[PDB]
A paper describes a structure:
The human KCTD family contains 25 soluble proteins that share a conserved potassium (K+) Channel Tetramerization Domain (a subtype of ‘BTB domain’) at their N-termini and have variable C-termini. The BTB fold of the Kv and KCTD families has a roughly pyramidal wedge shape and consists of five α-helices and a single β-sheet made from three β-strands. Here, we present novel X-ray crystal structures of the BTB domains of a further five members of the KCTD family and examine the stoichiometry and stability of their multimeric assemblies in solution. Overall, the pyramidal wedge shape of the KCTD family BTB domain creates a versatile scaffold compatible with a range of oligomeric assemblies and geometries that may impact function.
KCTD17 regulates ciliogenesis by polyubiquitylating trichoplein and its missense mutation is associated with autosomal-dominant myoclonus-dystonia. For instance, the closed pentameric assembly previously observed for KCTD5 was also found in the KCTD17 structure. We also observed higher-order packing in the crystal lattice of the His6-KCTD17 structure resulting in dodecamerization of the core pentameric ring. This assembly establishes an extraordinary T = 1 icosahedral protein shell comprising 60 monomers that enclose a large water-filled cavity. The C-termini of the monomers are pointed outwards from the external surface of the spherical body, making the construct amenable for multivalent display by C-terminal fusion of desired sequences. Overall, the BTB domains displayed a range of affinities from low-to-high nanomolar: KCTD17 (Kd = 7 nM) > KCTD5 (Kd = 55 nM) > SHKBP1 (Kd = 87 nM) > KCTD13 (Kd = 100 nM), KCTD10 (Kd = 460 nM). As expected, the complex of KCTD17 and Cul3 was found to run on SEC with a radius of hydration consistent with the formation of a 5 : 5 KCTD to Cul3 heterodecameric assembly. Analysis of the SAXS data revealed that the scattering curve fit well to that of a structural model built by superposition of each KCTD17 BTB subunit with a homologous BTB domain from the structure of the KLHL11-Cul3 complex. This model placed the Cul3 subunits at the interface between two BTB subunits increasing the overall interaction surface. Homology modelling based on the conservation between KCTD17 and the KLHL11-Cul3 structure suggests that the close proximity of a neighbouring BTB domain in the KCTD17 pentamer can provide an additional Cul3-binding interface that may substitute for the lack of a 3-box.
Author numbering: 29 to 130
Write the structure that this text describes.
């Protein structure tokens, strides 16, 4: 093993590090790459399998990188929210919600 981790999210593979995923100790991702997830399934390439849409995963992963929420203009904020709720990142869910009143 190493510091690098591959996540197969709905058929698309994302490359990142343990440091990035484990910024939120109670998140699904930190729990995943620490082997504390019961359903830890991996393909032959060693990538973690996630039955979620990869379209809205980029922003989630970027928040874990630089702490900010950045969206392109055409991307639905509702889609990112559903993912943030699934991966259980509190701070991000809040920021998204706070962005959806005005």
């Amino acid at each position: 093993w190493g510091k690098w981790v591959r996540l197969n999210v709905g058929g698309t593979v994302f490359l990142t590090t343990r440091q990035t995923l484990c910024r939120e100790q109670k998140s699904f991702l930190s729990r995943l790459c620490q082997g504390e997830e019961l359903q830890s399934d991996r393909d032959e390439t060693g990538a973690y399998l996630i039955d979620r849409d990869p379209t809205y995963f980029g922003p989630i992963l970027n928040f874990l990188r630089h702490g900010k929420l950045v969206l392109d203009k055409d991307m639905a904020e509702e889609g990112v929210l559903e993912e943030a709720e699934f991966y259980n990142i509190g701070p991000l869910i809040r920021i998204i919600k706070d962005r959806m009143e005005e």
